[PDB]
Amino acid sequence: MENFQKVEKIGEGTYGVVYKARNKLTGEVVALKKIRLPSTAIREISLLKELNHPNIVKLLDVIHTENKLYLVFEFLHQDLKKFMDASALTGIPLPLIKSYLFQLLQGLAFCHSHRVLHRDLKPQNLLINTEGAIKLADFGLARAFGVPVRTYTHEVVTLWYRAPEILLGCKYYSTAVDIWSLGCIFAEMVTRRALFPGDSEIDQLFRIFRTLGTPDEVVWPGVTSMPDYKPSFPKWARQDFSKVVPPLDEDGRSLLSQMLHYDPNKRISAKAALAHPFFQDVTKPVPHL
């Protein structure tokens, strides 16, 4: 009642509960996020008030009061997950898929240029508006809170978009982790079905392996010395993307292939992806929702 009016509960997010609230001074509606519990996190998150871009959900405030931590974000009404589910009989139209991917790559390119990663992109944290924009939510929170090593949520943590280096225990998180996640989301928009819906770390890893082939030192130098690599992993051959994401055209399949290279160093960058021929005919359509 001093600062905010509660409007309604939005749900249980990756970091805790999320409410729709109304700022009493400005009259604006916001997403107010209570972090389910350091000083270090508050400094890191507070710097994210500078990481502003049209395709990043805007961080409005960081509140530390009564030994509790709250983040205030711009409000958007729908996530990509809900929109895909609502679109499932028809699919999202291709021009809108392309628009959504282009915009997300612009947001990634900006953050990556500042050496900030997301680490946990998923359809539930890609928010859309009624004119055709899409925005990345919760960008830069995972490094501040130690995600994905640390877990805050009450829900099962969704492994479906995790890059293979994370699943194999790598120490070092590069920009490539976000390109992988986005590639998985691209495939999901096209096919209307998650690409790698693993229900455990090994099921996640084996779903990747069955589609892309079991990784080896030929495609990914050093993979066999990763902390969680097992020489006893089954050896699957790679499938062609033409079987994986029909009816995507060869430009799209080439782009997707590059987003899903095993070796993070070989993964296409967001800036290079924006120049791909898949985007020659990109436009900004209006969504049907």
- Residue 251 among known ligand-binding residues: no
Residue 259 dihedral angles phi and psi, to the nearest 5°? -75, -20
**Three-state SS at 268:** coil
Tokens 């021929």: give the residue.
277
Alpha helices per DSSP H over the chain: 39-47, 80-86, 94-113, 141-145, 164-167, 176-191, 201-212, 241-244, 250-259, 270-274
178 is catalytic: no
Considering beta carbons, is residue 77 or 114 the nearer one to ligand HHT? Answer: 77
What one-character-per-residue DSSP string does 181-192 give? HHHHHHHHHHHS
Restricting to residues 244-273, name those near ligand HHT by CB under 6 A.
247-248
Stretch that binds ligand HHT, among 93-101, 168-176, 225-233, 272-280 (CB under 6 A): 93-101
Among 62, 111, 137, 166, binds ligand HHT (CB under 6 A): 137
60 binds ligand HHT (CB under 6 A): no
What one-character-per-residue DSSP string does 178-225 give? HHHHHHHHHHHHHHSS-S---SSHHHHHHHHHHHH----TTTSTTGGG
120, 178, 249, 263: which is the annotated catalytic residue? 120
154 binds ligand HHT (CB under 6 A): yes
- What's the min distance (Å) between Cβ of 97 and ligand HHT? 6
CB 18 within 8 Å of CB 33: yes
3 binds ligand HHT (CB under 6 A): yes
Element holding 71 (H helix, E strand): strand 68-74
197 binds ligand HHT (CB under 6 A): no
Number of residues in contact with ligand HHT under rule CB under 6 A: 34
Annotate 254-282 with b (16+ C-beta within 10 A) or e (fewer). Answer: bbbbbbbbbebeebbbbeebbebebbeee
163 binds ligand HHT (CB under 6 A): no
Query: What's the length of the chain?
Result: 289
Considering beta carbons, is residue 176 or 190 the nearer one to ligand HHT? Answer: 190
Among all residues, which ones are annotated catalytic? 120
Binding-site annotation, residues for Mg(2+): 125, 138
Binding-site annotation, residues: 10-18, 33, 74-76, 79, 122-125, 138
Q: Which residues bind ligand HHT (CB under 6 A)?
A: 1-4, 6, 10-14, 17-19, 21, 31-32, 34, 63, 65-66, 68, 70, 91, 93-94, 97, 124-125, 137-138, 154, 190, 247-248
